[PDB]
Structures are given as structure tokens and as C-alpha cells.
Amino acid sequence: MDISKAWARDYLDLAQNKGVFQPGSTHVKIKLKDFSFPALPVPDFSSATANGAATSIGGAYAVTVAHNAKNKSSANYQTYGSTQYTQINRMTTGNDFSIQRLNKYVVETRGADTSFNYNENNQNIIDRYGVDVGNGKKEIIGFRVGSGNTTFSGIKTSQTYQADLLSASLFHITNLRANTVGGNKVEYENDSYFTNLTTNGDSGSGVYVFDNKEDKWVLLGTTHGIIGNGKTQKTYVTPFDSKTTNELKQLFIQNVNIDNNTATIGGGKITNKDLVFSGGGKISLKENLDLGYGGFIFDENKKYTVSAEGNNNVTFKGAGIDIGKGSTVDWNIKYASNDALHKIGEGSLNVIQAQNTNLKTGNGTVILGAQKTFNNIYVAGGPGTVQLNAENALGEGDYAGIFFTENGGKLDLNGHNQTFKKIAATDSGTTITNSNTTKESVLSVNNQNNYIYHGNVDGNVRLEHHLDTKQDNARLILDGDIQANSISIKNAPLVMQGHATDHAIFRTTKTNNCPEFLCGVDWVTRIKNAENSVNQKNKTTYKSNNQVSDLSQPDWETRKFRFDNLNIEDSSLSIARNADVEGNIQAKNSVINIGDKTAYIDLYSGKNITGAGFTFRQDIKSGDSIGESKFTGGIMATDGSISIGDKAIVTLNTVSSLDRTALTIHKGANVTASSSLFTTSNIKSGGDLTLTGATESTGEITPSMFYAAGGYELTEDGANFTAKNQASVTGDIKSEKAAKLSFGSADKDNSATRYSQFALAMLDGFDTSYQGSIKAAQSSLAMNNALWKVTGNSELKKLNSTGSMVLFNGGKNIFNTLTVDELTTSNSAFVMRTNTQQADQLIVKNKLEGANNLLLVDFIEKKGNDKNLNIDLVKAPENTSKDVFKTETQTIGFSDVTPEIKQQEKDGKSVWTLTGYKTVNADYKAFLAE
Secondary structure (H helix, E strand, O other), X not given: OOOOOOOHHHHHHHHOOOOOOOOOOOOOEEOOOOEEOOOOOOOOOOOEOOOOOOEEEEOOEEEEEHHHOOOOOOOOEEEEOOEEEEEEEEEEOOOOEEEEEEOOOOOOOOOOOOOOOOOOOHHHHXXXXXEEOOOOOEEOEEEEEEOOOXXXXXXXXXXXXXXXXXXXXXXEEEEEEEEEOOEEXXXXXXXXXXXXXXXXXXXXXXXXXXXXXXOEEEEEEEEEEEEOOOOOOEEEEEEXXXXXXXXXXXXXXXEEEOOOOEEEEEOXXXXXXXXXXXXOEEEEEOOOEEOOOOOEEEOOOOEEEEEEHHHOOOEEEOOOEEEOOOOEEEEEOEEOOOOOXXXXXXXXXXXXXXXXXXEEEOOOEEEEOOOOOOOOEEEOOOOOEEEEOOOOOOOOOOOOOEEEOOOOOEEEOOOOOEEEOOOEEOOOOOEEEOOOOOOOEEEEEOOOOOEEEOOEEOOOEXXXXXXXXXXXXXXXXXXXXXXXXXXXXXXXXXXXXXXXOOOOOOOOOOOOOOOOOOOOOOHHHXXXXXXXXXXXXXXXXXXXXXXXXXXXXXXXXXXXXEEEEEEEEOOEEEEOOOEEXXXXXXXXXXXXXXXXXXXXXXOOOOOOEEOOOOEEOOOEEEEEOOOOEEEEOOEEEEOOEEEEOOOEEEEEOOOEEEEOOEEEEOOOOEEEEOOOEEEOOOEEEOOEEEEEOOOOXXXXXXXXXXXXXXXXXXXXXXXXXXXXXXXXXXOOEEEOOOOEOOOOOOOOOOOOOOOOOOOOOOOOOOOEEEEOOXXXXXXXXXXXXXXXXXXXXXXXXXXXXXXXXXXXXXXXXXOOOEOOOOEOOOOOOOEOEEOOOOEOOOOOOOXXXXXXXXXXXXXXXXXXXXXXXXXXXXXXXXXXXXXXXXXXXXXXOOOOOOOOOOOOOOOOOOOOOOOOOOOOOOOOOOOOOO
């Protein structure tokens, strides 16, 4: 492998379908120390053996090269996932082709597609598998994956057949029909930039090529050998051979036509090959049946039963069970107890009795119809389903005896409740569901220590994380997608977060089993040193640190958390980076951190299943890792606290009620509450906080709502506090930072009012009311159509009121002063109060005012006539002008008492005074167009 351009881990990521090289990914490019892979989907390389030297072709069959027999097995002993398979037969061709029969059915992969036809003429093959590389120029491009003696630009690992080091080659075909000893062979050359040259240990590995018309990767053949040395090194592929393949497969077929009758089996007779059953019917065993290398294969769309004669106890043993699509096999015997039952195929195994053995399933449905149906279950490869159909059908221990490796499968609780201390899932290929739409399944997960569920939840499920005693370390962390009716949390923490994308590593054991003499620095260390400089300049050390993922990596999968309701009691809920959370929260004596900085990763994520596939490993690290997070819904809380952190985006579109529940909005958060929010406590905010009417209900249309904060709101930075669009906001607002905004839709509205005009007796206009005390001596205040009733002494920095504005209200003969420092009011409204001999308000200190305006007043003294006494109404020294409260002889006022004013008095402070009285859905905003 050449790592002068590409990172070492890049070749590995591709071969192991990690990082950006997920199966089916199109338009993939990688940064170099910039490179675009060809316009094709990434292959699925899961049909490759762990060591790369052979390729599964589905079922009990695999393909490799013939002279790999001489090799230290290399291909005689095959590992897929947690399972070992042994070649027990083969056929072999002069062109070095080898089709293999394995001792058991492969559970982990459905195998590579075998539709390559070497006997088509050159033009046909070019048109079927050719790739455009410019202007219509076709080349046959493909991928090869294996793990020969491994080298990274002159760093010698001396490692061969390591699964961790499974590495990918990209190539173009240079001769479809090269004339070699043995027969015609396909010749290829690697890409000159993304260059993984073939090594001896790669011999036998599968070569892939992509069908244009069927849109699928196809097994071209298997790697035969090389000629040459560096960049131009040629590789020869033994073309896949159907005829020889099919001849080997013929050696294992015994057709059994049951045809709805009954086939009785015993004594070497039916009244090793695979027994290939057809027609449906009953299968009865008179004794233990051991099929050796054979197993059961069932056709499609048929019903079968497997029974013991006379209700005896008989076991079956063999290659496994392969059930065709649309078929169901009622399995009413035991599979042998010293062997795993391997189930593949798309149909259903219906297990009527307990088995006292282990299951390995990779496809179709296995139904558990008995208590403790299997001792342990291993789910692999993606498309299998395990379905509960009896009480206590799962197994014992923390994991309920079920384990999901790579790509996982589905657990359908099917109306049953199931409890796990821990779910043993390696990745989000796993989902726990419930297909029963009429009886909800309670899924309980009651880990007492840090644990991450990597899998999903959907269907008719309720999720509970309940403990008997308050335990703050019992953190349940969900890394996958969660779709649940509801979620309930008591006494133990819940964490919702995204998933750090898994990458390949070079070696999972932390030791190098070669002494320092004769071997020196660890090759693992050497790769990290060799890429250190470019990693220091780009800040990407996570690429070469031999860890599966890193808290500081940028590549994170966003996860969806949807639920009608979450209930928390006496614990904490954290939404961390790349969680997208939506639903209603009820909280009691609990802590809610939205946009929490602490994220968790699993050092064995994606490789959590060990041993024979019935043991589970997990190692958790946590630390700061800041990224976008989303909460959408409502919050009903009692005590505890709520925290909204950097990069979080919260949308309260459901009514929120906080009682003794402090709300803190930190710097870098965006909180929009389009739904009513009441709180007996206070809200602190150093981010953006916006309060608006319900802009929902209709696809258009907006109804209004309220925001009360008894403990007031407090602003903590150069922040934003915006109220607009039919928002009625109660509770004082204080601040000593340079804050801004807002009251009132900034020209986003007018006079054309929708909604109930009986719901206009709560805002008059505007479409925004507030009340009513602002102590912010550094802060701005926009006022496009508003304002407040002012219930306290407000000393505000700056003010701009293009539109409807402030009045006073309303302490019992308790008068207050507003005080600005750049009051540029561009229009109406300024209703002030006084009884007669006691008046308030000394406003703008540093002048600059606006056009039109309306400085008004009102009372509690019954002056049946005039009272021509001296009480000022503003205090702007010298002033820019005077006509900043123009003479409009149309004042309704309060009662029938209308006094007048002045122009100037004490020094430069241009005040306003008083005079006498007069006599004159029926209004305040009756002066917008004045």
C-alpha cells in the first residue's frame, strides 16, 4: 500500500466498509496529504473471509484459487464473524479455479453475486461492466479486497491474514484475456494514486466488477498471481467458473418430494448430501438424525412440520437449515445440543419446543414459541428476524441470551415485555421492534453502569430505564434511532446522542508479539509517526491513532429520537451532539441538559461480539465533543433544572410549564418558543431567545399565546431576546451586558389582523405586548409596533420605536421613571400617569428623537374644570429639535380630562408640562396612521 497521498486507514476503511465507504455509497472522495473514487456505489465486501483469501458464494459454498491448498490453509479454514467454517470438499480447474463446499451453512453473509460470464465476447463484457471515465470512454474498473503480507509505504508490519488489516485495491482491467499458463485470465493494473499492490497472501481473494444494467457488484473471479513490481504490477484473476461451480453443487443434492405427505427418516432411509425438501408436508424422525456435512433445505411458499415419532426425544444435526422464501417450518424436535443450529434463507423456522442449544441465524424469521427457546441466540448479517411468541422465550443473563453482530437483525417482541440488563448489539443494523399493533411491548433496560445501546427501537414499544434506588452512574446511552410510544426514566440517567462513525483500525490487541530486538518500534506506532506531520497541520491525529472512533473526529451520524412522551423522575436527561430529539418531556426533580457537551464512544463499537458469538464486550470513553443538537416539543417540569448549551436548537412548539424549575440558555444556543411558556421561576439567557405566537395550527394562520416568568428573565452576554408575532410576555427583564431586541414583528405585519379579535384584548395590537420592567443599561430595544405597560423603574440604554409604543401601569399611586440614551422614537404612543401634584418620568438623557410621535397622560382627581400644575415629563438637554412630539389635536386619552404641555423650561432640558381639561373594539392602537 502506498500512503504518500492516501492515509493508511483509508485502504482499510474501504475494504471493511467503514467510515465513508458504507455499502452503496456513491460519489465518494477522500482528502490526500482531492481523490475521487469512480462514479459507482461502494461494494459490499462482507462476502470476503476475515483473512481475505476466499469469498462466500452463499450457503455452504465459497470460491478461491486452487494452489491456495498448499498455502497454510489460507482458504481451507474460513472465518465469517464469530463463526469458523471448514472446507470439506472442492473442485478445481486447470485455470486454478476452486469451488469449495464448507462443512456448515454460512450465517454471516448471503455471498457474492456469481453472474459473471467469461464466455461472452469482449465487446459485450465491456458494455455490461464498463465505467465512464470521461467523454464516454469506458474502462472496466473494479475493487479487490484481501489481507496479504501488509506494508504501508515501506513500513513492514510483517502481518499476513490479519482481519483488522483487510485492505482494498482499486484497479482497471488491462487485458480481459491474458494468455497465461493454465488458460485465459483477466489482467489488471492498480490505480496509480490509490495503490494497493497485490502480495502473495492476497492470492485467492475475490475480484469485483460492476454490472451496468443490473446495477450490482458481481464476483469477477479470484486472484491468481502477479507479474512486475511497482506501480505497473499486473495482477491475474482466474475468471469465475459457473460450470465447475455447478458441478460441485450437484454433488450435494438429494431431492425429497414430500408433496404434502409424510417422509419418515431413520436407519439411513427415507420412507452426505443436503436433503432438499419440496411440496410441503411432514417430516418424521424415528431416531436421532445426523446428516454429517449435509443439512435441511426447503423450497418456497410451503408449510412443513418436523416431528418425533411417538413424541420421543430426537435430535437433528448437520450443516444447518435453509428455508426458502414464503415457507414456514414448524420445528418440533431439538437441534442437537453439542452443535449450533445455523439458520439461513428467507423463510420461517417456527420453534415449538425449547432446544437446549445455540442458534445462529442470518436471514428470514425465527420464531420463539417456547420458554427459553434457545440457550443463546446469535443474529448476524442484516436481514434476519427473531420473534417472541411465548412467555419468557429469551435466555438468561444480562443480555437475555441474544447477541447481534455486524449488520445485526430484528428482535420483534411481538406483544411481549422483555427486560435486559444490557442489549448486546454491535451496531445500528440491530432494531428491537414490536409488530403487534394492539398490545404494546414494554422494553426495559436497567443497566447499573455506563452502557451504550448501538441499535434501534421502533414499532409499538415503550422503553423504560427504571432502577429501585437513585443511581447517578447508571447511564443508559442511546446511539441509534429511537422511535417509541413513550419513554420512562426513574432513578438512573438517560443520554441521547449521535454515533461517532466507526473506522477500521490496524490492530485491536494492544501488544506487538515480536521482541524489540529484531523488530524495533511497533509498526502501529510507525504508521502514527509517519503520518504525524500532516496530521498536526490539519489537526487530524484521529486518523492514525489506531482507535475505532475519536471524540474529536468530525464524522458523526445524526440519530432520531421520537416519542409521544418522556417521563423522568429523580435523574437526568442529556441530549448531546448530533441527537435530533422530538416529543414532550415531563420532568420531576430531574436535570435536563439540552446540548450537553459530554459525548460517549465505544472502543469496540462495531466489533462488540466475541468468542463463538455469545459473548459481548464494551469499553466506553467520554469527554467534551461539541456539535449541533435538536429538541422540539414541550417541557413540563417540577424542580430540578434545565440547561441549553452551545449549538443546540430548541423549538418549544408544545405548551411548557416550569414550577421551581430554573431555565438557563447558554451562549451559542437558539431557543424559539412558539408555544406558551409559564414559569414560577426565572430564565437566564446568553444566547438567542425568541418568543412567538403559535405559527402552526394551519398550513397558514397564527393564533397567539402567553409567556410568564415570575422570576423574570435575565440576559447574560451580547445576546438576543426577541418577542414578536402575537406574543404576550409577562415578567421583568434585567441585564448588564450589551444586549439587543426586540418586541414586535419587524415590518413582518400590518393592520390586517387574523385570529380571534377576542384574542386581541390581550395584545391590543401589536402583535406584541410585554410587561413590564427593564433594567438594562447597555442594551438596545427595537419596537416595530408594540409595547409595554411598564410596571417598574426601567433604566434602558438605547431605544427605537418605529410604531405603536409604551404606556404606564400601574402601582397604587406608585409612579415610575423610564430612562433612555438614544431614544429615536419614530412614531406614536407614550401614555403617562399622575394624580395631580405628584408626577413621574424623566426620560431621554442623550437626545436624538424622531418624526411624528405622541406624548400623552392620565388621572384620579375630579377636576370638574381646568387646573392651570407644574410637573415635567421628560429631560432631554438642549435637544436636536422639538417637533418630536408634533401637535395632533385628536386625543381620546382616558377620561374626559385633557391637559396640555410646553416646549422648554429648566435650562436645556426641554421638558413638557400640564394644563386643564375638556369634554368629548372601540379603542389602544387607534393611532397607527395618525
